[PDB]
Design a protein around this ligand. Structure first.
Ligand code: FAD
Length: 296
């Protein structure tokens, strides 16, 4: 008796020791040439073998030998494409991959293994695919639900997956009639992911979809404070808190680790004005499958 779409769920069909070998079809940088770090959108072939659904992850074993001599362990990535995929043929999986580059304490420029592998993939090359993994971030069964989605960076990926099923696809058993509300936080305009796709959705279903961005380096609120995802949210505080009281409202959070801090801070103020301690109210939201977080 789960409140999420988990009928016939598949988990761990393919194992890291023996993964499904797909091929790269397309691989495209989807950030501007000026953004802080490039993100690539990529489409793999699965010939229908990898039966996922909105909100799951595939794992990726990257080609190569570690500093010791034995194969790399997998890195999980959220599925950017919806169940039926970007081609609608149900034979593809897509990823949204931030290329990881930082400079370490010692002055060296260090490239993350699995993300740089994916971002250097050419169409034709083989990719080792494991999974699908995850049961937390599945859509609500309820088609008249409210589905507030908070996301930073590559954390937009499951939400693209979500929304494609809702607004870009016809299904004889799922017709979304609730409210879908995306909040996407990024540094620059050039860091904006799938903007066009989301814009298109907003105009196709203006009743059911609401879309707010948060560009910290270019945007500012009344108090001149930088526009983080919680800063944007703060503008619709009284309203989001009102939806949360409703027992058919599902919140999803996905993106970099740091993002969960700011949102909580604002929820404290919001909850305090009602006379309710947030940090504890969230625990009832968790139990009820309504506050769903997953950060990395
Ligand atoms: C459920 C889930 C979903 C995910 N979805 C996505 C996704 O959709 N898109 C995406 O791009 N990633 C996603 N990730 C994160 C993904 O695991 C990373 O891309 C991956 O860890 C990158 O590792 P790498 O192999 O590129 O680098 P690695 O070789 O794994 O290097 C990582 C190590 O470097 C260190 N490190 C990390 N950051 C820094 C830093 N800034 N400065 C110094 N040291 C650092 C840490 O010790 C870390 O363990 C997801 C992770 C999880 C758990």
């Amino acid at each position: 008796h789960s409140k999420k779409q988990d009928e016939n769920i598949v988990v761990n069909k393919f194992k890291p020791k023996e993964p499904y070998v797909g091929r790269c079809l397309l691989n495209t940088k989807i950030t501007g040439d000026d953004a802080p770090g490039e993100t690539w959108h990529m489409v793999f072939s699965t010939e229908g073998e990898v039966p996922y659904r909105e909100g799951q992850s595939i794992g990726i074993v990257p080609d190569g030998i570690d500093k010791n001599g034995k194969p790399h362990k997998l890195r999980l990535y959220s599925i950017a494409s919806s169940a039926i995929g970007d081609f609608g043929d149900s034979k593809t999986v897509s990823l949204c991959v931030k290329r990881l580059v930082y400079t370490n304490d010692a002055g060296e420029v260090v490239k993350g293994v699995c993300s740089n592998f994916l971002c250097d993939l050419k169409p034709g090359s083989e990719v080792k695919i494991t999974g699908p993994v995850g049961k937390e971030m599945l859509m609500p069964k309820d088609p008249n639900a409210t589905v507030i989605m908070l996301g930073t960076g590559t954390g937009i990926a499951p939400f693209r997956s979500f929304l494609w099923k809702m607004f870009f696809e016809k299904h004889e058993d799922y017709q979304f009639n609730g409210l879908a509300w995306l909040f996407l936080g990024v540094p620059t305009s050039s860091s904006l992911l799938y903007k066009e796709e989301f814009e298109k959705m907003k105009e196709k279903a203006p009743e059911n979809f609401r879309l707010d961005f948060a560009v910290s380096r270019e945007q500012v609120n009344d108090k001149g404070e930088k526009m983080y995802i919680q800063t944007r949210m703060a503008q619709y505080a009284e309203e989001l808190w009102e939806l949360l009281k409703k027992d058919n409202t599902f919140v999803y959070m996905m993106g970099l680790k740091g993002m969960e801090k700011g949102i909580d801070d604002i929820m404290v103020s919001l909850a305090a004005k009602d006379g309710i301690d947030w940090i504890e109210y969230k625990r009832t939201l968790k139990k009820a499958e309504q506050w769903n977080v997953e950060v990395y």
